[PDB]
Design a protein around this ligand. Sequence first.
Ligand SMILES: Cc1cc2nc3c(=O)[nH]c(=O)nc-3n(C[C@H](O)[C@H](O)[C@H](O)COP(=O)(O)OP(=O)(O)OC[C@H]3O[C@@H](n4cnc5c(N)ncnc54)[C@H](O)[C@@H]3O)c2cc1C
Ligand SMILES: Cc1cc2nc3c(=O)[nH]c(=O)nc-3n(C[C@H](O)[C@H](O)[C@H](O)COP(=O)(O)OP(=O)(O)OC[C@H]3O[C@@H](n4cnc5c(N)ncnc54)[C@H](O)[C@@H]3O)c2cc1C
Ligand SMILES: Cc1cc2nc3c(=O)[nH]c(=O)nc-3n(C[C@H](O)[C@H](O)[C@H](O)COP(=O)(O)OP(=O)(O)OC[C@H]3O[C@@H](n4cnc5c(N)ncnc54)[C@H](O)[C@@H]3O)c2cc1C
Ligand SMILES: COC(=O)c1ccccc1S(=O)(=O)NC(=O)Nc1nc(C)nc(OC)n1
Ligand SMILES: COC(=O)c1ccccc1S(=O)(=O)NC(=O)Nc1nc(C)nc(OC)n1
Ligand SMILES: COC(=O)c1ccccc1S(=O)(=O)NC(=O)Nc1nc(C)nc(OC)n1
Ligand SMILES: [Mg+2]
Ligand SMILES: [Mg+2]
Ligand SMILES: [Mg+2]
Lengths: 582, 582, 582
Amino acid sequence: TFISRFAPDQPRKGADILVEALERQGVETVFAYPGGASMEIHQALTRSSSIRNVLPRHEQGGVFAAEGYARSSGKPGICIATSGPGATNLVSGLADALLDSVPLVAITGQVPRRMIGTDAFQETPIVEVTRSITKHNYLVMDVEDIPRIIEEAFFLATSGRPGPVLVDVPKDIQQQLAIPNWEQAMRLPGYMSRMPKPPEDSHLEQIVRLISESKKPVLYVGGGCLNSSDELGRFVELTGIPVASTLMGLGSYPCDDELSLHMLGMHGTVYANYAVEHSDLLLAFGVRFDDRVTGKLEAFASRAKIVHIDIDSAEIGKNKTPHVSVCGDVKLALQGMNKVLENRAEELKLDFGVWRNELNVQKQKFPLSFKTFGEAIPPQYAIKVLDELTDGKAIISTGVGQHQMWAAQFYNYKKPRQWLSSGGLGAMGFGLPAAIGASVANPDAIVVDIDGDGSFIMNVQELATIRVENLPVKVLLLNNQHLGMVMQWEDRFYKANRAHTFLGDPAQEDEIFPNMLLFAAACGIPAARVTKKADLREAIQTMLDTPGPYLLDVICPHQEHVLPMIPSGGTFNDVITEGDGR
Amino acid sequence: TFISRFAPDQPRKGADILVEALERQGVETVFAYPGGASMEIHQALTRSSSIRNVLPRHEQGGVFAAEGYARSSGKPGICIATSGPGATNLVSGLADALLDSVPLVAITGQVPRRMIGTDAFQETPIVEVTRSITKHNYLVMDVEDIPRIIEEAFFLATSGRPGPVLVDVPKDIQQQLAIPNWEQAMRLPGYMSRMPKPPEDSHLEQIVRLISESKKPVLYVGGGCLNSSDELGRFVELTGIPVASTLMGLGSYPCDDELSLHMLGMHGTVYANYAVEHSDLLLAFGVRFDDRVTGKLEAFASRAKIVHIDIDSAEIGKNKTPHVSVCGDVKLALQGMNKVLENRAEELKLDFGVWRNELNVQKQKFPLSFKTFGEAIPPQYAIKVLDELTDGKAIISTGVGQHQMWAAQFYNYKKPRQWLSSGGLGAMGFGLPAAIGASVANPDAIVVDIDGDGSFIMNVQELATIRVENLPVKVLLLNNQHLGMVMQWEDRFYKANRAHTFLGDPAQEDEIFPNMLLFAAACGIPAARVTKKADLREAIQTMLDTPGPYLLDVICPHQEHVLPMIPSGGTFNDVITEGDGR
Amino acid sequence: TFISRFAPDQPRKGADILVEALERQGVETVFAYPGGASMEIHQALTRSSSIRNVLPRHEQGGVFAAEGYARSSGKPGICIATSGPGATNLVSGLADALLDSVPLVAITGQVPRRMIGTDAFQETPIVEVTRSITKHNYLVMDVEDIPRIIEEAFFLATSGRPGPVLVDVPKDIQQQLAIPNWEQAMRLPGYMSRMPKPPEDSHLEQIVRLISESKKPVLYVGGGCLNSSDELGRFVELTGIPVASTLMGLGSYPCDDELSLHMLGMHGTVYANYAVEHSDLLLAFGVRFDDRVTGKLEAFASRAKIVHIDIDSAEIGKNKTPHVSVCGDVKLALQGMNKVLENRAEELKLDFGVWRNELNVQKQKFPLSFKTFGEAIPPQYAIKVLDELTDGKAIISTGVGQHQMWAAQFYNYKKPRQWLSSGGLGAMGFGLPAAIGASVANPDAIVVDIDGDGSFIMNVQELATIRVENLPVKVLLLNNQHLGMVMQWEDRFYKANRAHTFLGDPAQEDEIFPNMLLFAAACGIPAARVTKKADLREAIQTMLDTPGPYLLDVICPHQEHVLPMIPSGGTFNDVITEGDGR
Ligand SMILES: Cc1cc2nc3c(=O)[nH]c(=O)nc-3n(C[C@H](O)[C@H](O)[C@H](O)COP(=O)(O)OP(=O)(O)OC[C@H]3O[C@@H](n4cnc5c(N)ncnc54)[C@H](O)[C@@H]3O)c2cc1C
Ligand SMILES: Cc1cc2nc3c(=O)[nH]c(=O)nc-3n(C[C@H](O)[C@H](O)[C@H](O)COP(=O)(O)OP(=O)(O)OC[C@H]3O[C@@H](n4cnc5c(N)ncnc54)[C@H](O)[C@@H]3O)c2cc1C
Ligand SMILES: Cc1cc2nc3c(=O)[nH]c(=O)nc-3n(C[C@H](O)[C@H](O)[C@H](O)COP(=O)(O)OP(=O)(O)OC[C@H]3O[C@@H](n4cnc5c(N)ncnc54)[C@H](O)[C@@H]3O)c2cc1C
Ligand SMILES: COC(=O)c1ccccc1S(=O)(=O)NC(=O)Nc1nc(C)nc(OC)n1
Ligand SMILES: COC(=O)c1ccccc1S(=O)(=O)NC(=O)Nc1nc(C)nc(OC)n1
Ligand SMILES: COC(=O)c1ccccc1S(=O)(=O)NC(=O)Nc1nc(C)nc(OC)n1
Ligand SMILES: [Mg+2]
Ligand SMILES: [Mg+2]
Ligand SMILES: [Mg+2]
């Protein structure tokens, strides 16, 4: 089933063994930036015909690209960097992948073994630095271990709760000649013995019982459902329970469906948060009860029986104590409960119409809304138009801040892995690189980075990557000349006292700065600016129609505020629904 | 001697106490990028009138800027970032400051104390992550400790062997009201009891003895001498010993002086390495015997008595065992030895003319050299011209790679703190941000970033910072469309097999890509390109003469190789002195 | 409410502040062994009139004594040791207290601060060493922190899940003069915000629901119920559910009651394990699903709904996933469920007579049994007699091994804190020292150490402590000349191949060795030996009647085997019920 480029008895460099280790794992793409300690690895890379390398312009671009690749394909993302500065430049990406549970395998070059700990050239104790920001990590001490460690890394990064795994490879090991043993068994007894077994019928049937004994059920869906799109659908079909999603769960259940309550949390819909606030049964599937979502834990779903299904036991009962729990794959649980629900519909007679309408009225009285001023472009509107013109089938990556919230609020995702956004760590500059990985993973898809002017500029160097790699990446830049989300808090809680939130030039207060169009031009990427709400539709359509990469600079009034809003640590009763920075 | 903005009995936010803590330390500038967990700190910042904030476009820009500020002023650099992604984006800067021993104080916001360890919004265990890449770090657990911890941080960052110190401040502590006690004593008994005492006359006089009993003495100067410019000068004057400098020591002794052997090491002059190879007395002052400099330790200064004066005992005998050592401030030792040398000249009669000429001939036979092809611009030449037109009085910051080596080789530094380059970690993208800090620290100085096209693009977003802050930063971009240093190794040790070292567009092999001029234009920074060696002088002169920031895109043939070169782990006998990538 | 021996304005040594810190905590006894680094503390101790010190003969005796004191009084145990060897000699005790969740506060002297990390005289990084074997630990760096750290330590050791807390105090801090501030607030925001809130009626009532819907309920009681003796009683009274206890839970519910199924697990009764094996509802209160108890997790209570009430969330779902969980104080939950059970008895009509009899028959067919051979003394019998003559009201401490199991099997505890045994770590030599602490904590109680000849000899030096302190400690030494439990496994799984399990003298195979009677004599403790089952009753009675300490050397045939026995990782179907080493 696999053909090596070497004879089973022919010795080859550890670097070449590391690359074949990747090919044997099904790796087709990696994002690697060459450095002294990883030269061997890059040389081995060029000897490969099945693995393509997307050279980024910054190691951080590499990780974020790998994250996009992973988040949009369900496959693990692979990034490679040299020692020292190379490796430390991945740090934010690793922490981001760990907090969001995105499978990622990071390989870093290291100084030769004998040089470790001596303050050598371009040396950093990366394994020490990344131990708390990765699911697991390694320092290869012998070429003989390469096959086994690579297999283990991918396994660990992919199984259970996905996450990042870093593999540190000393240069001397990369140069050492050896004959790989692809038959080596993995040394993960503890981990493998702790892997959840499929859910028991007893547990699942008790849940279906609770569902039939409830009057106000609510589904609390998160990132753990990204691979249960179909199972969840059939489930909602058989129970008729309204679905509230987290930022990480967007797309598990179509936001356009009538049973969808959309996103809950700090910036969730008034009706989504309402449903939870008054539910008597909370079905938390693939969620981690984040503070962004729960606000004051005690007030969160205070009057309801909570069911929590998570693949990580450490998460069950971390913030909220469930009445019922199931440590396992939610995809399996949904399938199990689905069989039961089908072969008992007659006697169950599930009907939540009353509750559903109690919510549809809330959905009618307090829907997502925005205001249009003169000919200024409403960010929400731009995203609303993008949706329309792409028929909600585009892969959307974003930065962090207000634009991020709107991209989540005003675009309806049809499927999972269409939404690529940093939620746990919320790292700025994630948008452009993430789109790069996504595009490489989905060559025929519409990839759009809905970015902010602050987030966009942080990794603007990846524009060069986009041009050279010829990725049809579209950039919908919502330019508001400010660090949006932070200025919103300045307005709400600091009497609009600006403390370094303005990103333009004070010498020319009324001038878009910088001129993002020229950053695009510098990398041979066609771009245009839009300022009038009237030209928006045609502008976006152009971006979409023009083959290849494209940057649309959408100017927006900065005084916009993301609403609704439940202050940090607040209650549903503290939800803010009106106001802005005017 | 200090006037607070609050009454000694008036309670104020921890954030305001943290800022006054900075003002009481003499801080005038900080490089802070606002984030959720640090909002309070930024608000307190705007209440200050003595502290100016230079808002960067990326946290990494912030650290590197702080490093430049420090490296060019002898003062500690201060950068502030929010929690999570903010904090992790400083990692490379901290590691860089630790390896190069540059005083730096980094402050990061943190989620509220009660939220620590719960996987909160934008939370990362930064103190855990940075413990091995900082001199020391803290997690403030009470507003009462702010005054003391800030004082301790600056003390630790500034004293002994300078380095970075990170202070983690939970948001709730920033908001807590209290009355600061600026009288609190520091809790550093261990550290303070270990601080070296001034050198003993016995030790110093034994050295002067060794000097008088030697025939081939050589001074091995490094970054530890950056504050002993005058002392070292008088010393060389009284002994007439040739001076070899490390990359970090450039400028301690004028490279233009006839007694200067310039830089030694991997890319040091043939004569500098020769002097060491045959010296019978090595005066290692403020150096750490780096592998870049020593090559194979056993062959390094194998036939000579080694004297090592270092402020860090852990460094004495780490790689090479001295015959004589002095754990203390080299500035003090030089002064001590200088008194002795003056009051004994008569009986000492130091005369190393023979040795000096044995070297001046080597300096004549094997000098630094470059080749000029047709009208192509030689990078070495461009730097040679910059020197001339700036009369070697400019502050030079750089990226990493070939251009870095040439900037060190072909520019003569008159004083220390004129050279700002990442040597230990060798982090790319250091050049532009470093120049920003340097300029802010030296408003009337000529600041030039001699960058590479690969390093420049990594933090190209700081161009916006430069324009908005109106810093007269000049950028001498040596554009060679490649990752220079790595392609050099490809040519020498990999049969010129290119493995992702080309930074241009393959679709247009013969086209400068990206167009750096447009990156400059995007930020309203005047720029020009130069391709003919003939227009070089006028182009550079223009850059220098044009007020404000300026970017000169100097195109260079990529087949240039930095020479001479002693392969990694080699001997002086393996020194390569000829060849390139043609 | 408290009277200091110093004026509120009078400065005193840190050592004196540390002692008053203890007095203010209600400490009356401490077990401290003087050493160089703790001299100051001992001097301060003698100045106290409310605190008595029990000087042990070994630091390990000190900890184990403190454990006994704690385990038998519900109060925290306090031990003090000097630096270096003193501190490392507490290690086993700390690990033991952590695994069994016994509140303990350990104070260790340390070299002066400035000497830390320099390899000073009697220096060990105890805080580093004990971090993983203590609930939490500290290194006092300032005399000003003493009051606060002591308060925090006791709080942490006492609240939530009790455990050991070590406080490292440098000698210079002990000597520093200062004025204590007993008003200092604690810095435990994270911990205090995570402390479980009282159980919700919703959760509790759902449990009472499950109870009424079950036919085969079983109570799984552990050490977490040691303070819910009365609540549990009323609970069993209102539900009539059979009670199975763990080794740590013995005494929570009287083993003599007819509703008692006694101990379950590896060496639990056949009927106790049977009840669990066939229960349809498992009420796990204050247990941690230990491998000794569960055997193969999947087979454990495989056919029943599991309810787990634990004060530590980390324990809920660690080994077995419950159908219902309650993170909180089981004492509160029992009280809550008790109110509900009382005000609903009429409609509940709980009747488990059928199940109860299905078990009473198992209790009849497979009861605990032992065989008597000629006139040899059966260990089980000796313990059975002790019970009778003490009317099961004695406090029993033990060593580890077979005698430990029998002491648990053949003695009926009426109340909690009557049973003092090392269960998690299972540390030998715990018996004698533990009895010392217990006796000091319960001066009027009958304290008996049922020890093994191997465990007894390990800390036989504490006999001196017993005599000097005049503690009426009785020692029922079950002498079998072997390391009992290990020889049992040799017989069962190693064809009786003795591998260093014999503790007697091979030169005189048929001679009791050593002569424990003489160890007693050496410390002026009356002792006697018993070899005939006939003299047993009178011998034990004598021990009990003779005032003061007493040692009874009970000789037993070594071929006895503790039964029943479920092999490690086995199933109820693998339970061994017959055989020995004959
Ligand atoms: C500016 C900003 C504002 C934000 N505002 C909001 C907001 O208003 N509302 C909101 O929802 N979020 C918001 N967030 C995102 C937020 O920080 C959290 O990232 C998000 O709430 C996490 O949701 P999650 O727990 O569902 O997903 P994840 O964090 O991805 O967690 C998924 C969980 O599912 C489990 N799981 C994984 N795979 C499986 C499987 N196969 N079977 C069973 N279980 C599995 C995991 O182990 C884990 O516990 C915001 C972020 C930013 C940057
Ligand atoms: C591409 C590349 C190529 C390189 N090539 C070379 C090369 O060819 N030659 C070369 O020299 N370097 C080269 N380097 C730089 C190299 O990595 C090391 O950074 C440099 O050799 C370190 O020199 P140093 O030890 O003198 O200075 P530092 O690393 O700054 O160390 C200074 C030392 O002085 C001590 N000290 C500090 N203050 C005082 C005081 N007041 N009194 C007494 N002692 C004190 C310190 O504690 C420490 O041990 C290169 C780097 C890169 C990125
Ligand atoms: C030779 C040998 C043989 C052994 N054989 C057996 C055997 O056959 N059967 C057996 O049972 N054990 C046996 N053990 C003991 C065994 O190792 C474990 O110590 C014991 O099973 C632990 O029981 P536990 O979990 O109930 O108690 P603990 O270990 O004390 O755990 C108590 C639990 O209760 C929780 N809790 C504490 N306080 C409260 C509160 N107020 N409210 C709610 N929850 C609380 C804790 O946080 C924790 O999770 C043996 C040990 C040895 C040395
Ligand atoms: C990355 O460093 C190490 O891994 C490293 C660190 C310390 C000693 C020896 C090495 S090495 O001998 O095995 N490789 C090495 O030195 N490589 C390298 N590659 C480039 C492209 N430029 C330069 O030096 C200018 N060096
Ligand atoms: C940074 O997070 C914390 O420190 C943090 C983390 C977890 C809980 C509570 C906080 S907080 O209540 O004290 N501050 C906070 O939540 N700030 C904040 N600032 C901005 C500008 N945007 C958003 O949220 C979109 N939140
Ligand atoms: C315990 O050591 C330290 O704590 C220690 C360790 C290193 C330096 C200084 C000390 S100290 O000066 O503060 N105390 C000290 O030296 N005490 C002590 N007590 C006895 C009873 N015997 C001996 O020495 C034979 N020394
Ligand atoms: Mg913005
Ligand atoms: Mg280049
Ligand atoms: Mg024995």
